[PDB]
């Protein structure tokens, strides 16, 4: 990651820059910092996943804590900017596209 | 119409991969002198080594410390190539004389053959009602011997050549010959359950012409959705070609069933070969590296040489950085022609004298130099593949229900239950290669390869089962692949006998929750 | 050719009163009182109603086929407006509008007896006034129970809300001034629990919606804004039935517990006709409504009213506000759509290729998809496609420029297809028109090309991962679904412009569709161009299947009687040519950033064993029917490879032409509004709350937790 960093916005430094990167970031910090007012108000409780990431449960504690762990470094250290455009129409085979994780498995559900 | 039987040769009479062979037995033969430990000569036969193995479980047995087990787990991993290169050097030997293809796949049949039962099941039936209850491989001989009573608790027996007799004529019994001599291994049971397939349509494949068929090198250098697809035009298979969901929903809903079990076995493994395609995948990521399944074939083999070496070109893997990363180990290999990736005097060498000495990201550099190269129809990483464990170790990962190890075997009795009525009179006697196997021959085969019990020793479950539950404190099956502290200990355990794999595989392929209405790959 | 008298003929009423069935039953719960749709009043409705029911040819959906309601079957493949325009002559709207609004009510009447049938709203969210709370708001907390899977939720009430006000402290002490107040206990164990849990877990005071529904075309016609739309609406209500009668109690509730100043300026309101309490709280962007199509009635998520007809957008917001001011920003203004006739309305949407469901149900034969057995005969060869050859560079020529940015090449890529609609339109100007064949083509090509250009800007380590873009045809699919309602561009509420925008939205869909196909066995996401392709047909190109894989793909959407099928055999022979286009520029002109990406696409000699595979696969016998249906609806222009290059080359050439106007931001996408400062006027927010909890220290009493 910081390499990437490094090579591209690193690669000139002036004193102008200085400024400029800097209210370049905090705009985005104010738009980044402005997402939680905006979807906090839209959430609900019945999610089948935040029930379970919450639980106290002891034999559920340690389901997770392995699961984390080890899925942790297939997570990315990137900030994608369409991460909250969506698309309207929804093909059944491309309904994956509003997602936008790094790591979907599918979740198939058997009755 | 003439890629059936140029294909063949390549499972018989290719001599890139006769000269890869001897190559492989004779660091075999060289290596089974220079061992601290402690001896069969190239041209003995494979009835020497079947008895020089359980020799060897004799000697190694006996010799059994705790300290040096790593000296007595590559001298079983050592013999079960060299039983199974004795066994593919049949072909390779006859050909080369005899130049007819028919003949040499007679030489098969004529080792398995070695030309030359009903009051069992009745004693059982009764005794199952009786339970009817977990105390059946509770019985009392298992009362006297607990966990780690005695070197023995990790092994067969006591070493006895009859009790290894025992197994050895049981599987031939009951047709399953095959498996017992080769374990559960990726590629050399995939092999020879094509040559097992080819005498069985030797008129269909061949001289006819009218179903394809392929090597079992082909079959591991396609992809991953694109094996089935293989596999079904080997078989008389038919079905819709493009299927988006995956190939275990897909392959339910065409009702196979008379299937052939041979073809059975293949399912199984291309099953097994796919979910081995994925583990070496899923834990090698680093960062830039980035490797997926369906990637081709020659850019994952460009990919992971591009990774460890920068230069692209194939370099050693065991002197490179990034296999020196996670610990610094030395770098002694004698022939430093330049020296190409998959060398067998190089490859060999590792695995003889370090590959003990790995931790588990060094390990999986091995298995994915010989994952790459069989995605690449190389006959060197083919022959390198069969003194790899981790091909053996493909039945560890087949445990996914989460039901009690006593409720797989209540499945097991399921399907005897059922199997005992279903007698037409069908007598299998040696495990031949133009016969069939039945579900019967599978069901009674793997039953009676568990519980034999032998001058009191215990049989294979009452050491596994015991293993199990007085040893790691487990009820649930499944949980022995979650939490690395069951796991990394789990793979130690079992890596003593290669026929505990051929047990696992013999236990998975018959203790399904739908084995007693169903097929088995069903 | 007769002129039209209000009468109608036996076959449209037949086509007509099926297209009401469908439509009050489209949820399937049966007829639906919401569902009605004013036509004379308002004609923002009407043509709605003309668009998804009447001048598309009839179907019935999936869901509905299991319902099976009234007669469809001798109506199936047939449309009301085609036969009406064939039968009559050309008449004016307004005739039209009493015809089908006569038609209309006395269907009402035969599903819901005596009651008024009244116009479909249009919702307007507002959640908070001033950053106060305009209901009594909902506590959120990450607390747990053990007894129920769900979160702690306690919903405040309206006495409970006075004491929740008059609080001077943060929302923290609110909670806390409320605890006293409240009587029950099944409710004081219910807040004893949130407040106790405090320092470990969340908790937020988050405001419910109120929506304001209203009739658009009847209120806002006068007024000069929306903003200044619904401040005529209320002034209705409180002076004064409405169901907006309960935000005018609630009004009047909130600020007689907000006593003196807030009290005044509201009652204030209702005389002067400068005010405005209306205001927006975040910049506001195309497009101000959302339409609902009738699919969006269906999808759980959305989980919407059956009157819902236009919703202000989540890109839009109001909040009621005394003090803060309306900024200059063209899109506050009222938008009615034009009256026009029924002839040029249907050839505004009239596009060629969404009948393509019913060409294959007339005169279209199924085809049998390829079984196993019967692919190995018609194939010979299993050998592998391999080549590993260097290209020559002298048949080459440099188009492809990598220094370009990526969020300059989502502008580029907007800008070039501006030109192309600009050119399509314009030029044939001469009344069953379609659209050009070569479009479809220059919208997934050109899209590709820029998709296509991420991938290699990632792979190339080049791009900042502070704004990867993900998706570049988010930015194409989000800018033509909103380019006619968009100041600054030529389209600008240009009726031609509405299919050919319409139609490069939802191409622009399936582009990155093949290019990202996450696989069915491994859920990952990746920086390759062939293993978006490889996923998609569960092959590699290597493999000898590859050419049967691509097409017995498609031989699943074409069985379906799917229009998709030749979006996506526009869309995957794209890709293969994308691959052999960076492949010969790379490799002949950046050559070390060749070596990075060598890997990760496909040798064009290895492309073209493909292309020269599936041209002849179309060919065959089984595959006839394929060819043909495409042919109908497209042109083979995508068969050559010189004539795509040369729509590549003219892309890839136009950056270096138009690299000068380059200067333009990217139009904003994102679901999420713009924010907007606004006076900190807030319960936790007030100036007197500042000073507040600075006048308590942290106490070591409660620390203790005694």
Known sequence: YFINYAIIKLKEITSDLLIKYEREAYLSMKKYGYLGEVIAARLSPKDKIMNYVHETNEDIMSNLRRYDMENAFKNKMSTYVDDFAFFDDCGKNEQFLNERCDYCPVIEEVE | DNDNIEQLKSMIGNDELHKNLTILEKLILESLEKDKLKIPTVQSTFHDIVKYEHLIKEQSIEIYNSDISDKIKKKIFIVRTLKTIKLMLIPLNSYKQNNDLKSALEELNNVFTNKEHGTFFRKLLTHVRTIKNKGETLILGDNKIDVMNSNDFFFTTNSNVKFMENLDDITNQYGLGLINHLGPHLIALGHFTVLKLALKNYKNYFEAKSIKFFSWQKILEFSMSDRFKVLDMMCDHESVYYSEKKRRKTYLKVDRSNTSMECNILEYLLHYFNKYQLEIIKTTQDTDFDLHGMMEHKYIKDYFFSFMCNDPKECIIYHTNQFKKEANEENTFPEQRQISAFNLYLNYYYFMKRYSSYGVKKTLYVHLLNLTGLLNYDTRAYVTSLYLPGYYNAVEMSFTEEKEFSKLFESLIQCIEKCHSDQARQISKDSNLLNNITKCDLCKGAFLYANMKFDEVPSMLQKFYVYLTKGLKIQKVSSLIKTLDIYQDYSNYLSHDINWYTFLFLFRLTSFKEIAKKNVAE | ?706
């Open chain 3, 1 to 706: 050719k007769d002129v039209f008298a209000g009468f109608v003929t036996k076959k449209l009423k037949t086509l007509l009163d099926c297209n009401f069935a469908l439509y009050y039953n489209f949820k399937g719960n049966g007829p639906d009182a919401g569902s009605f749709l004013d036509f004379v009043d308002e004609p923002e409705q009407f043509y709605w109603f003309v668009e998804h029911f009447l001048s598309v040819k009839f179907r019935v959906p999936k869901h509905l086929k299991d319902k099976n309601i009234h007669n469809f079957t001798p109506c199936l493949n047939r449309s009301w407006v085609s036969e009406f325009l064939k039968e009559y002559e050309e008449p004016f709207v307004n005739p039209v509008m009493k015809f089908l609004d006569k038609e209309q009510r006395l269907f009402f009447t035969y599903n819901f007896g005596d009651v008024e049938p009244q116009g479909k709203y249009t919702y307007f969210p507002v959640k908070e006034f001033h950053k106060y709370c305009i209901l009594p708001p909902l506590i959120k907390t990450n607390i747990k129970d053990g007894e129920s899977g769900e979160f702690l939720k306690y919903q405040l009430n309206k006495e409970e809300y006075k004491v929740f006000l008059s609080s001077v402290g943060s929302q923290m002490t609110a909670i806390k001034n409320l605890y006293s107040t409240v009587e029950d206990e099944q409710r004081k164990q219910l807040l004893k629990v949130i407040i106790e849990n405090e320092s470990t877990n969340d908790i937020s005071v988050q405001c419910p919606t109120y929506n304001i529904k209203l009739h658009y075309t009847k209120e806002c016609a006068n007024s000069n804004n929306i903003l200044k739309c619904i401040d005529e609406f209320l002034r209705k209500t409180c002076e004064k039935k409405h169901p907006s009668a309960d935000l005018c109690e609630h009004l009047q509730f909130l600020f007689e517990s907000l006593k003196n100043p807030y009290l005044d300026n509201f009652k204030k309101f209702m005389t002067n006709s400068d005010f405005t309490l209306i205001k927006p709280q975040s910049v506001w962007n195309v497009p101000i409504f959302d339409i609902y199509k009738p699919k969006n009635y269906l999808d759980s998520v959305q989980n919407l009213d059956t009157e819902c007809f236009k919703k202000l957008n989540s890109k839009n917001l109001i909040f009621l506000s005394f003090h803060d001011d309306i900024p200059n920003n063209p899109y506050y203004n009222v938008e009615l759509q034009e009256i026009v006739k029924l002839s040029t309305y249907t050839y505004s949407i009239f596009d060629k290729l969404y009948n393509f469901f019913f060409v294959f149900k007339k005169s279209g034969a199924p085809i049998s998809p390829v079984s196993v057995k019967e692919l190995s005969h018609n194939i010979t060869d299993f050998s592998f496609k391999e080549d590993n050859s260097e290209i020559q560079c002298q048949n080459v020529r440099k188009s492809l420029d990598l220094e370009v940015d990526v969020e300059t090449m989502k502008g580029i890529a907007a800008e070039k297809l501006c030109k192309i609609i600009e050119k399509f339109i314009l030029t044939k100007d001469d009344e069953k028109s379609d659209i050009h064949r070569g479009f479809r083509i220059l919208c997934i090509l050109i899209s590709t090309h820029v998709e296509a250009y991420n991938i290699v800007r990632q792979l190339l380590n080049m791009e900042s991962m502070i704004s990867l873009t993900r998706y570049t045809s988010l930015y194409i699919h989000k800018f033509f679904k909103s380019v006619t309602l968009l100041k600054g561009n030529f389209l600008y509420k240009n009726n031609k412009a509405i299919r050919y925008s319409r139609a490069c939205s939802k191409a622009s869909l399936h582009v990155p569709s093949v290019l990202y196909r996450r696989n069915i066995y491994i859920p990952e996401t990746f920086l390759s161009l062939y293993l978006g392709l490889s996923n998609l047909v569960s092959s590699n190109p290597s493999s000898p299947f590859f050419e049967y894989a691509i097409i017995e793909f498609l031989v699943t959407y074409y069985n379906k009687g799917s229009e998709k099928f030749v979006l996506y055999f526009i869309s995957i022979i794209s890709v293969l040519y994308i691959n052999e286009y960076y492949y010969e520029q790379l490799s002949c002109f950046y050559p070390k950033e060749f070596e990075l990406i060598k890997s990760r696409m496909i040798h064009p000699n290895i492309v073209d064993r493909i292309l020269k595979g599936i041209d002849n696969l179309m060919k065959s016998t089984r595959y006839d029917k394929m060819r043909t249906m495409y042919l109908d609806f497209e042109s083979s222009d995508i068969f050559s490879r010189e004539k795509v290059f040369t729509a590549l080359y003219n892309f890839d050439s136009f950056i270096k032409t138009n690299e000068q106007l380059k200067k333009k931001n990217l139009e904003e996408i994102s679901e999420i509004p713009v924010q907007l400062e606004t006076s900190n006027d807030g319960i936790g927010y007030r100036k007197q709350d500042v000073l507040y909890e600075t006048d308590k220290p942290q106490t070591m009493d409660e620390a203790s937790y005694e």
